[PDB]
Design a protein around this ligand. Structure first.
Ligand code: Z1I
Ligand code: NAG
Ligand code: NAG
Ligand code: NAG
Ligand code: NAG
Ligand code: NAG
Ligand code: NAG
Ligand code: NAG
Ligand code: NAG
Ligand code: NAG
Ligand code: NAG
Ligand code: CL
Length: 341
């Protein structure tokens, strides 16, 4: 037994198929090791460990991991970062995230909270020790979290301080709302995303309930964001290499607390995009000729709350995002790094 809250350089694992041109595949083929063919866990009997997912070095290590991954893979024709115009080649590539496992070196271990109620901060009683996290897809996106794991029971909200406005609010859903995005083959930047309205509005009503639970049963209202760049104000994501910007006004505004129908969302495949790895503009080439389609699972929501609602009857939440650290911190929440002191 015995351990101390210390962080150390981590390594990565994956099932990257060699001789596949998937950029994720070819990054994990040269930067990660083959997955543990026999891993195992040891329930720490009678334990109470304190993970603080909002402050954790695992996520930052993952961050630079995806920064590098994307840097050598998704490479723009032109890159305008600070005072510099980087011109290079931009062949259209293969793109579809694959799970990445994080794995401690000898002397350290990973503490996994198996309490299904776990919100991220605060002590956990079902602790459980593993040398590698689980398989995690590094999906880059704003507002909506896609292709991730879901809460084992109730919908859980995670925050670094609910009270504080700026401190992002993350919503971990307990069931999957599928979203289906397409660019039909022969305007080529016009795209759209189908999302079944009954599903969405029902779960949104479950969220809104729990949201109320954490906030003194105040009036719950989900409005579209209050200014920002497209990235922030539009569900942005990358499908097959293309950057979809989808105008999710319907979801946070149709307020059908019975609506029904299969909602169809407008989208634009953006070329010049404000980056997420760092301040700058990246201009890629036009999309490819053909049916560009991705069907993903909505497994979370990035929320930000309005400030001066102290002396009022309501609390307004607008979808946010932009910090992809929070995206990672949505899956690593149940993981801690311990040095064996
Ligand atoms: C050091 C800063 C730099 N930075 C940033 O400047 N922006 C501003 C820009 C709008 N102004 C939106 C950035 C963003 O999310 N982009 C993005 C791109 C592609 C896809 Cl597919 C996606 F889903 C999202 C976030 C990222 C931030 C975390 N970081 C702290
Ligand atoms: C604690 O979590 C582990 C992981 O699955 C499992 O044994 C069970 O869910 C929990 N154990 C007990 C004794 O409740
Ligand atoms: C998270 O759970 C801990 C312990 O149950 C509690 O003290 C804290 O207020 C919770 N935070 C949120 C944002 O629910
Ligand atoms: C999800 O959690 C909510 C609590 O907000 C609960 O009402 C609902 O039944 C749960 N659904 C599933 C499928 O777990
Ligand atoms: C004033 O607003 C903050 C949110 O920014 C809130 O946490 C605080 O409780 C409010 N003040 C009072 C006295 O409730
Ligand atoms: C949470 O946010 C409120 C709002 O500013 C602040 O007064 C309080 O100190 C914060 N809590 C912590 C533990 O920092
Ligand atoms: C989407 O969610 C369903 C049910 O929650 C699950 O069975 C399926 O594997 C998920 N798809 C992906 C790609 O994760
Ligand atoms: C997704 O949308 C496309 C075009 O509308 C359609 O052909 C396909 O059947 C849809 N699939 C799902 C799972 O919604
Ligand atoms: C999204 O579409 C709505 C119309 O449904 C429009 O009012 C709003 O300005 C659009 N938002 C953005 C960021 O284009
Ligand atoms: C979205 O909200 C705005 C107010 O911010 C309103 O003008 C507009 O009608 C709403 N859109 C829908 C589709 O309800
Ligand atoms: C989510 O996973 C599905 C199945 O692997 C994939 O087709 C889709 O492109 C993924 N979505 C994103 C945004 O990566
Ligand atoms: Cl190993």
């Amino acid at each position: 037994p015995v351990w101390k809250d210390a962080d150390t350089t981590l390594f990565c694992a994956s099932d990257a198929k060699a001789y596949e041109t998937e950029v994720h595949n070819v990054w994990a083929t040269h930067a990660c090791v083959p997955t543990d063919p026999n891993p195992q866990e040891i329930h720490l009997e009678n334990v109470t460990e304190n993970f603080n997912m909002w402050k954790n070095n695992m996520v930052e290590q993952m961050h630079e991991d995806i920064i590098s991954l994307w840097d050598q893979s998704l490479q723009p024709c032109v890159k305008l970062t600070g005072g510099s115009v980087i011109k290079q080649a931009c062949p259209k590539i293969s793109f579809d995230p694959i799970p990445i496992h994080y794995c401690t070196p000898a002397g350290y271990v990973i503490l996994k909270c198996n309490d299904k109620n776990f919100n991220g901060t605060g002590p956990c009683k079902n602790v459980s020790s593993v040398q590698c996290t689980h398989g995690i897809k590094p999906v880059v996106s704003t507002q909506l979290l896609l292709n991730g794991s879901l809460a084992e029971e109730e919908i859980i909200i995670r925050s670094e301080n609910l009270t504080n406005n700026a401190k992002t609010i993350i919503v971990h859903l307990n069931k999957s709302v599928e979203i289906n995005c397409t660019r039909p083959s022969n305007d080529i930047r016009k795209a759209y995303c189908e999302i079944n309205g009954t599903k969405w509005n029902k779960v949104l009503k479950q969220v809104t309930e729990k949201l109320k639970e954490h906030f003194n049963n105040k009036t719950i209202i989900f409005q579209p964001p209050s200014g920002g760049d497209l990235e922030i104000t539009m569900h942005t994501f990358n499908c097959r290499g293309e950057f979809f910007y989808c105008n999710t006004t319907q979801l946070f505004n149709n307020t059908c607390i019975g609506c029904n129908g299969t909602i169809t969302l407008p989208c634009k495949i953006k070329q010049i995009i404000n980056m997420w790895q760092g301040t700058g503009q990246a201009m890629y080439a036009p999309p490819i000729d053909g049916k560009i389609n991705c069907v993903s699972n909505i497994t979370g929501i990035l929320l930000t709350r309005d400030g001066g609602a102290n002396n009022t009857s309501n609390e307004t939440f607008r979808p946010g995002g932009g910090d992809m650290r929070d995206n990672w911190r949505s899956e690593l929440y149940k993981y801690k790094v311990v040095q064996i002191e």
